What we know:
By secondary structure, chain A is of the alpha/beta class. The first copy, chain A, has one domain (about 35-170, about 225-445). Helices cover about 40% and strands about 15% of the residues of chain A. Chain A contains twelve helices and 14 strands. Chain A has helices spanning about 20-30, 40-55, 75-95, 140-145, 150-170, 190-210, 235-240, 270-275, 295-305, 325-335, 365-380, 425-445, and strands at about 60-65, 100-105, 120, 125, 225-230, 240-245, 250-255, 260, 285, 310-315, 340-345, 350-355, 360, 385-390. In chain A, the strands form four sheets. Chain A has an eight-stranded parallel barrel, surrounded by five helices. Chain A is globular and about 65 Å long. The N and C termini of chain A lie far apart (about 45 Å). Chains A and D meet through helix 2 and helix 5 of A and helix 2 and helix 5 of D. The structure holds tyrosine (4 copies), chloride ion (4 copies) and cobalt (II) ion (CO) (4 copies). The site of one cobalt (II) ion (CO) has 5 residues of chain B, from loops. Chains A, B, C, D: It is an enzyme of class 2 (transferase).
Amino acid sequence: SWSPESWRAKPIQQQPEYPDAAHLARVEQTLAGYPPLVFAGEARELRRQFAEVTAGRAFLLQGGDCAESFAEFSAAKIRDTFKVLLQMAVVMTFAAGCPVVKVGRMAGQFAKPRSSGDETQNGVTLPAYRGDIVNGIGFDEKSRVPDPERLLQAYHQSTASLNLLRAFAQGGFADLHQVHRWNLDFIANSALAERYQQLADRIDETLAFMRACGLDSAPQLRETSFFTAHEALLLNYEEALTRRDSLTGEWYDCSAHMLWIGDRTRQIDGAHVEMLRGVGNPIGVKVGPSMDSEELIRLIDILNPDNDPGRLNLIVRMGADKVGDHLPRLIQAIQREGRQVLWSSDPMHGNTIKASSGYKTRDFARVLAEVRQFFEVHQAEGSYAGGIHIEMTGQNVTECIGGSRPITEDGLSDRYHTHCDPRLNADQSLELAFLIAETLKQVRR
Amino acid sequence: SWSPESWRAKPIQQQPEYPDAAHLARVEQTLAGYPPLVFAGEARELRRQFAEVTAGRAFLLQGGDCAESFAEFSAAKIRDTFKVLLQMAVVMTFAAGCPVVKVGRMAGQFAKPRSSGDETQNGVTLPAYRGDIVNGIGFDEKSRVPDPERLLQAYHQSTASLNLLRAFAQGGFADLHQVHRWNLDFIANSALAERYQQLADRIDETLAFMRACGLDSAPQLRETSFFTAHEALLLNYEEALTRRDSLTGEWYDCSAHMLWIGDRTRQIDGAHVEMLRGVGNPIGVKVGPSMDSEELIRLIDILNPDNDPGRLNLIVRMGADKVGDHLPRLIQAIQREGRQVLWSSDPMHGNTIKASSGYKTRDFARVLAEVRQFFEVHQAEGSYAGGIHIEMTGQNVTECIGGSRPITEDGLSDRYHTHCDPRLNADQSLELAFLIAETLKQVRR
Amino acid sequence: SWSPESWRAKPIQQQPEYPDAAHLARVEQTLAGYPPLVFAGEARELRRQFAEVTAGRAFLLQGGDCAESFAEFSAAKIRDTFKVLLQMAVVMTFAAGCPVVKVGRMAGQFAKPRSSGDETQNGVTLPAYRGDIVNGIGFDEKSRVPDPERLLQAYHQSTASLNLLRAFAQGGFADLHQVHRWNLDFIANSALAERYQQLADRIDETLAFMRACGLDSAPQLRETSFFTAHEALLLNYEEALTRRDSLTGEWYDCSAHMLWIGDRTRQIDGAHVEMLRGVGNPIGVKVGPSMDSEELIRLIDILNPDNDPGRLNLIVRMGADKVGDHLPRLIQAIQREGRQVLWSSDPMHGNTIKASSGYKTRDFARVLAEVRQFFEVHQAEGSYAGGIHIEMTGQNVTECIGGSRPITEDGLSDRYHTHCDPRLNADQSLELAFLIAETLKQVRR
Amino acid sequence: SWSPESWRAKPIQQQPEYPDAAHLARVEQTLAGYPPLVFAGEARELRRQFAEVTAGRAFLLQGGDCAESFAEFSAAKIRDTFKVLLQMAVVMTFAAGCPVVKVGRMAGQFAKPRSSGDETQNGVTLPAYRGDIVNGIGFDEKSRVPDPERLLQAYHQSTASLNLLRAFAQGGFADLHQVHRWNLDFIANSALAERYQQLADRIDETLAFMRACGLDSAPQLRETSFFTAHEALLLNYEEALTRRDSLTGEWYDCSAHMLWIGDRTRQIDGAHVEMLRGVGNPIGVKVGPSMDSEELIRLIDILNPDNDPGRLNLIVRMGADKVGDHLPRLIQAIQREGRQVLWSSDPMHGNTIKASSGYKTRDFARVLAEVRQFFEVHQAEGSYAGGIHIEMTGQNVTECIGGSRPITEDGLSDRYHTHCDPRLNADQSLELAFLIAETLKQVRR
Ligand SMILES: N[C@@H](Cc1ccc(O)cc1)C(=O)O
Ligand SMILES: N[C@@H](Cc1ccc(O)cc1)C(=O)O
Ligand SMILES: N[C@@H](Cc1ccc(O)cc1)C(=O)O
Ligand SMILES: N[C@@H](Cc1ccc(O)cc1)C(=O)O
Ligand SMILES: [Cl-]
Ligand SMILES: [Cl-]
Ligand SMILES: [Cl-]
Ligand SMILES: [Cl-]
Ligand SMILES: [Co+2]
Ligand SMILES: [Co+2]
Ligand SMILES: [Co+2]
Ligand SMILES: [Co+2]
């Protein structure tokens, strides 16, 4: 049996050490009485769309921030990231004839898991930066001491962001007639921009023809659903935002539509798995090179006992060099055991190079190579390459090398070469979308 | 005041001389108690679509036989002609973003007006062939004597043909997923066929995208309306099939959705105008080189006194050499007097050459030139080039010269070089449709 | 293996003796080249709706003439009969929340099976009247001698009637806003009329609310499909109108959407079964008191070998006194053998009394009692009471006794007390519809 | 010319005195960079729906809190209030055949205008309570001193509330199949509950019939738009949340879809009018007994110079005794000057009795009487009674007397008898909705 607090009896990784247990417990009670970010009905609806993807009838697009910050809390940033998602989605939808389920790493992607629990600079040692929901990026004691009030500031940033996203998605901004306005102005003067603009023209023509057929007022052309997801890492936050469905009594983590377990916190006897075990949300697990096939099946026994087809997303991040070698055996096990899973590629977290200095690089060529091999492996095994899961930005930067143009080492993107990881820019997100699109067309031909 | 028989008190052209007035009157009473081909509601609906065309928001496609015959009464022929109409319609609809109103010269286009009321072969003189509804094509007395029973045979051919057309249109045959199946198998191995096939592919993609958007079950994609029209020439037929609307009391000629007055029977004091004066149908008049602008306005005063915008179609057939010279002055008059009319081009009946032998030729190059000039003239005057009105066939023939390939002088098409006129084949209908389509796109750009 | 003519090698009942085999063969060739009444696509669509009924997700309404006549060939009669069908359909649809599949015994219900092959009046003996498609009702030699030309007159009446029905159904007459106009003016001044008028008001309110919700332009509210059916009795007619589907090569009897085998012609080794064996249409068989359960299963093996769920309608006509006793055993056999069938009640042909004089009576109370027991029997056995199959008229008569008002013995209805059977009038059809409606609501509650 | 800060140069009522101008200015800059509650596109859409109401084709329902509080910030409270709004809306929509535009006094209704700028208790005098966005209800210095940080707490409560409302409205909670679940469990055991339950049953039947017609998947049945409104009283808040539309450059107050000017702050030369003058939102003005017809027209010249038909809502709150006397002359002036306005009744703020003690009472009988007279007055003058504007709650209380049951003087509702006003409960909101509904039906009959 399970409760929202049953995770507290399990062994646990990646949790901060709060200096005042009582203070933390008061912030948790405050948050427990605040309204949920999502309504349980919607999580059920996302499960229904996951099941469509799992059965080969749609494709999952999951994208957004590496970690949202308090210092970057702007309408512009939320809008631009959502623009890139819509662009990708329409490119894939039109070229492949395939519904795309859109899920943003947004409105609650704050907590960060770290390779080390502390950090050392010239003889001074401080707790590690774990994301703004926990503590601050500044290398100094007041910054790094965990502050339970940050829970509430993360929540407030999240209701603001999701409120705006829901407005954009339902209120006209995502209407297919807006197809051109989704292109950020810095995608121009290149074969790729020309390419989007031509596809957009084709969409204009499609809608004009639908209008001439008598379908101009269909609500389906004017609005779309956008869902939210983050890593369920800080379980105090997740617990306070877990709520019983009014109609059914069943527990849902209402911090987000979908939650996932990170690669370093997926211990089968651990707290993170125990949390997600007993919520009704669609969920995901990060599947990196350390996962073997026995371990994977046991994990699925726990996270999806009834083998429901819209429950579990397996998010494969292996490295461009390792996916060929590791994935086949994992799929084969799932097929053999008759499991229903949604297979996604995270082509980014397995392709990060750390220099001795701590400076992080991601070669976009390797990101593409992992993706291409993901699809090849599915192709060979008879299973379905079901989704993509990327870190990206609508800001005019270049954080991943070996793209089309050389990188920007801005300072605005220094956070994304040290404490966070390099994100795809809009050029890169779009080229990815076109590659996915051709590949999907070929699968379905 | 007006009745279905008020035409009988007017002077009249092009009527046959029946040998037994009483016998004719009995066939007329028989036909008067038979069911109507169309229901008044539908004629009102066509008026509504005419008004859309008249206002520049749609385009009228009217096509079919020169004159239907009793010897060519086959499902195959009806289907193939309707295929060509759907092809044309979709080509225009997709490329121009414009609804097309589809009207077939079918299910009652039997009566034919003739330049002479008799015919002479080597010293023997016989009444002229006036179409199978009147008499027979054979040069012999029994054939040429008007037979009132032929009224009923025309009616029976008409209910059969329209029944089938309504079945095709509503029952799945006209569903947009059928776009490829409308291409007749003899349109192939040419840039034009390649062109239709590419447009059809674009339509497949549009529908697949609509499916992926959640619109796959829209009834608008699956069915279309098809309307019928003929020249109201034999007024005995027309009267017997004129019926009062159940709800409103108002008279409708229920032989067809739309009726038109031919160029030789449009005398303002004449029977034909008097007939159509008092029916509620959408109607048309043939406007050839002999029409002046004073005459045209008076005709419109009679045929559309209330200046209703879906009532009157002006069907301009001038000759490739004469349209430039004649049309401008006609449009200018209408504009000046504020009249609402639907302007169509009949590019065929003004471009017929009669050799001394009676053998008829139509150069397709001239057909295209009249069309191009029609649009140019509208362009120059500020008015709307609203429709096309052609004779065509889905049979694998070539009756009009100077197309892409040289003609067929079959014998199957000898009727269409003597008593009837050469029809456009499917290649020719399609090239026309593509020209119309580019022109409409340019008008609306 | 099967052909359209393979029935001619089988033993056969109820066929007329034509006096000139050659003449008959010429009329058959004429008819073979005439267009079909229906298109194969539509027959497939009706199979799809039958499958919905068979699975308990819709209800089948089949109604129309006992036998159409040449003397009663009027738009008014076709319209009024169709009005009664729409009335019944909407009453059932609204009160029961259940789609109704609408099938008219119209546009080809001409041939009649007879208890005797001749008739005797005061010493003179003549071939029996077999319906106007064969011969004439007049007791005299010229009338009664089979005339093959009557085939063509039946065909022409059929294209006229179906053309009009398709017009009504698609062209605005069947639009749900017309709900009141379907009530014939002689249903008034009674609790039953009041009842329809209230339901119609409820439908007005429903549509107004749909309009206020933004659904006013849905095509689903404006049009409906209407299908046709008759007894496939005169196989010469049926063969000439059997045609290969263009796309699939497969044979369809295109005289009508659905054909059925009568109770007296359902010999398993016989011609009628052999005809329908190899057409793709939805079909029916009349199941009267003489049918046993072994015989029924063998018949189904032949008529539906693949056990397709939209293929076969079993039309049960037992008598009010006999249904209780006979039906249970028939259903039990079907259930046991896993057969997919659409069960309908014909509550009329088993409830006819013939006086010594030949004068036919049908007590409406018995018609209702057979219906009520049909549903009771299904209720008891676990199967689905799937449809109703009645003879009815929109004319202002009373042919069945023991209704609400006493009968009309008009002369207009003397055909329906001798050579044909008494039909339900509109009062009676409606009361039936309300009973069916309550019963269906209760089944689904 | 106009800017978001141009109000600061005008004379102004009802503003608090902040103790630190600099601190306030910092909180304002913080809020200025936070995301907007609404997107400009949506405000334009609400203008479009206002225009529908103004033209007599819809009805405006505006309801919610008197003033939201920080202590009552729960999902339950937001949900229950929204339930009552949906109930009212559907009752009106179904019975009257009329679209209802739904606007909640929610997600930013914090600031309160007061009759006096201070309050005295037993010799101690303190600044008046102006709502939680300004200061605190507690009678003590720290509470009553204006705190600029409260701006941000109001904003955070607002994004949380609107995020949830948008979720409910779009995500399944407002789906018409939920009609029964909107009834709060304490509306039961009464003719009024029975009444809602019967209407809900009628809605079930309507949807079942739509399903049987093939419309079960229409998005229009599943989602609705919900808009937000408050009094634009604290202009510092409003300015910080005023933002330029991305596409058009035009300014919108993005704190809410609609803003209104209160009765005490509508000075034509004043700050409040100057603020709303130059935003693109739909807006309202409170029109109480002190407004004369000259004054009203000048106010409209300023607030709607172009006389756009979806711009201005006149919210009439006169008193049950005074509406008869005052409104006629106001309407007559508007009619005479050809102004397009949306006329609403606020039947509550003119019907409040203050005892010498400060204890506030509202007699529901008087609330109903003002409403009834509003409609009567419109009826007499030829204008349109366009909306209703009420304070209400989904909590199980009785704050207004003379309803059906005697009041609750809870303490939970003591805020609503002193600093705020008594709200309608759910019984009362519903009875109102049924009265409005009959009245609208009668107007449109
Ligand atoms: N409404 C459809 C199609 C759609 C997709 C994306 C959009 O931006 C807009 C519409 C969907 O959500 O799938
Ligand atoms: N139903 C639409 C679109 C359409 C057009 C042609 C078709 O063949 C099919 C559908 C119309 O009639 O305009
Ligand atoms: N179009 C739907 C609903 C309908 C039924 C009957 C009608 O008369 C009209 C509409 C159908 O055919 O089932
Ligand atoms: N979607 C429609 C109808 C509707 C109304 C209220 C609802 O709760 C649901 C649907 C509208 O917003 O007007
Ligand atoms: Cl699931
Ligand atoms: Cl008109
Ligand atoms: Cl089937
Ligand atoms: Cl406006
Ligand atoms: Co990362
Ligand atoms: Co011709
Ligand atoms: Co019978
Ligand atoms: Co108040």
